[PDB]
């Protein structure tokens, strides 16, 4: 008789459920997985153990409320008839019944029309033990810190401002980029797109993040005193890492530890207004100036990574649902927008890349520019017309990291931008990019000088930095190697790797300018 399988599909992980719940057996989980992390060599041992201890509460709590639970298990298993599997299924948000407007580029400015200036940070990771001399490749996911070991006697160990390699930065490295922004300003405000903890990942409490987020934020506010600080939540902040459950998990799991220290942090740059939301779900909005306003969404509701969001991984927060009733309010009162966030959209989940992409085209207008980090090297994504995915109509600039993780120089970045006047775009007029070279840095008793690196429309002869000036940029590097190895110089903040990028590599680098919409391969299409 099979007009029972269903019934005893529903017993047996609802067994399964209540058997999770007991710590005992969340240990045997684990105990299982680290054995296996061993065998595959994916980590040194110590490692294995740490991070599966660190992560299986939570994972096998998601485990047993998404995947594990009976309605969704046995719909998979037994289809529609007993349960309903929706695990990552697709959703669309609402737009208003407001006509779109013409589509209108942003008119050139003026002769002397001020210039707003922005500074830039991204990706800060510092590493509170990072360590002078210690082995930079050593056999752990982050290195030249304590427990690294030495190095072989063949190779130096790590410079004392930061290692070409698997390393993130000392305090006096951050302290030092703050230290030297003087030829570099004066700044009208900042933008700070996240990740303020290392990649140590396999170890992190809530007190060595909540350390972390104290430490630098005191120590931005030390160097730039009085100009507004505007933050953006990365991935790195929470423990364990990428872990953002959405604000429907209440209790002690949640985020609230995080969201509520980071509204005190920086209660001195975010109105009232913005820290109520930046409690809820870590995004906000503001006016920097009458006619501009500003929105730091949390990218981490979007996230691959985001293992809560096989809960439901629905427009969670509300966030875009909230991000159109801001647009639509920009849109009726003539406001430009600057949207800031950590993991640029072309990286996100499938459906909410997807309703992103829908939302940029249907505010272009008002959309002024977009600002993002995450990926650590210096790129951008192009956004097209839905209608036919060739009309470019906006851009986001993925500015390079503080960081050196992996490999790469320090760096920060620097906006001109159609500034604060009544009729501004508000749009970017041009950037720079600044970095440490550490192999003149690293002389013993030399102290670190931060170099201007490039300014975009001069090495690239760009007569703006409009959508259609990155759109063509992309196909000028389609066919001139030596301008596309500049770009590739430049994306890894002065240092590339030696291995070649040849014609593939070439190719997938371009492809990915023109994402900014995840799994789409049509974008591509002009490209391969
Ligand atoms: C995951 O979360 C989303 C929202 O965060 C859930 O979607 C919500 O589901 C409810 C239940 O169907 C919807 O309410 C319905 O509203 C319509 C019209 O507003 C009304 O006709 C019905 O009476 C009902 O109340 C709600 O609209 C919907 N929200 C969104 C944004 O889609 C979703 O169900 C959650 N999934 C799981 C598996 O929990
Ligand atoms: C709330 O949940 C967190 C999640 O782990 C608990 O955190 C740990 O607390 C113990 C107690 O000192 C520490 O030894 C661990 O290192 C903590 N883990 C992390 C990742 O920081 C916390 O104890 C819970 N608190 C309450 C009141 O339930
Ligand atoms: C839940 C829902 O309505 N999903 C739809 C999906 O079926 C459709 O393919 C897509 C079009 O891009 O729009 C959205
Ligand atoms: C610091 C200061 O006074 N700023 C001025 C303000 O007085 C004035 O109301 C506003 C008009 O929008 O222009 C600005
Ligand atoms: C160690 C190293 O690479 N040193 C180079 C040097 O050879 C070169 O002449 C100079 C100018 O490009 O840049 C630096
Ligand atoms: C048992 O399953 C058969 C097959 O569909 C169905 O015709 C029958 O009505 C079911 N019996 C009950 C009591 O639901
Ligand atoms: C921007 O301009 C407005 C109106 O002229 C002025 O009130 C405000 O103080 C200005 N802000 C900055 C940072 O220049
Ligand atoms: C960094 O410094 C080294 C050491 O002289 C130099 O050869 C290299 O060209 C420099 N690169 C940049 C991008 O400054
Ligand atoms: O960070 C280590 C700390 O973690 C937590 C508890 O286990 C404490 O006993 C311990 O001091
Ligand atoms: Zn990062
Ligand atoms: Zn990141």
Known sequence: WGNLTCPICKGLFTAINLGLKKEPNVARVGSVAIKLCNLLKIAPPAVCQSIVHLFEDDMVEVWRRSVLSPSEACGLLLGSTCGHWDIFSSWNISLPTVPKPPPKPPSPPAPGAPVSRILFLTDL?????????????????????????????????????????????????????????????????????????????????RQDQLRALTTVTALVRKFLGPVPVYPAVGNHESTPVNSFPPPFIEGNHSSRWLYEAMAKAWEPWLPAEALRTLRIGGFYALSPYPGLRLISLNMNFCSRENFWLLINSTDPAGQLQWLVGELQAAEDRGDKVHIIGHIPPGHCLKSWSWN?????????????????????????????????????????????????????????????????????????????????????????????????????????????????????????????????????????????????????????????????????????????
């Open 356 to 528: 992103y992409y829908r939302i940029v085209a249907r505010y272009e207008n008002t959309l002024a520019a977009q600002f993002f980090g995450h990926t650590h090297v210096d790129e951008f994504e192009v956004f097209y017309d839905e209608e036919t995915l060739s009309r470019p109509l906006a851009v986001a600039f993925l500015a390079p990291s503080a960081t050196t993780y992996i490999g790469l120089n320090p760096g920060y970045r620097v906006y001109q931008i159609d500034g604060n006047y009544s009729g501004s775009s508000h749009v970017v007029l041009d950037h720079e990019t600044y970095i440490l070279n550490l192999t003149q840095a690293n002389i013993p008793g030399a102290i670190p000088h931060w170099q201007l690196l490039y300014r975009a429309r001069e090495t690239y002869g760009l007569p703006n930095t409009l959508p259609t000036a990155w759109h063509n940029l992309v196909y000028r590097m389609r066919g001139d190697m030596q301008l596309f190895q500049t770009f590739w110089f430049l994306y890894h903040k002065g240092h590339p790797p030696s291995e070649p990028c040849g014609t593939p590599c070439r190719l997938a680098t371009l492809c990915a300018q023109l994402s900014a919409r995840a799994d789409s391969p049509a974008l591509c299409r002009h490209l391969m």
């Open 125 to 205: 990771h510092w590493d509170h033990d990072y360590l002078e001399g210690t082995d930079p490749d050593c056999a752990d996911p982050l290195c030249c810190r304590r427990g690294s070991g030495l190095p072989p006697a063949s190779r130096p160990g790590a410079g004392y401002w930061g290692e070409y390699s698997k390393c993130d930065l000392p305090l006096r490295t951050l302290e030092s980029l703050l230290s030297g922004l003087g030829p570099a300003g004066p700044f009208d405000m900042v933008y700070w797109t996240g990740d303020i903890p290392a990649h140590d990942v396999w170890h992190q409490t």
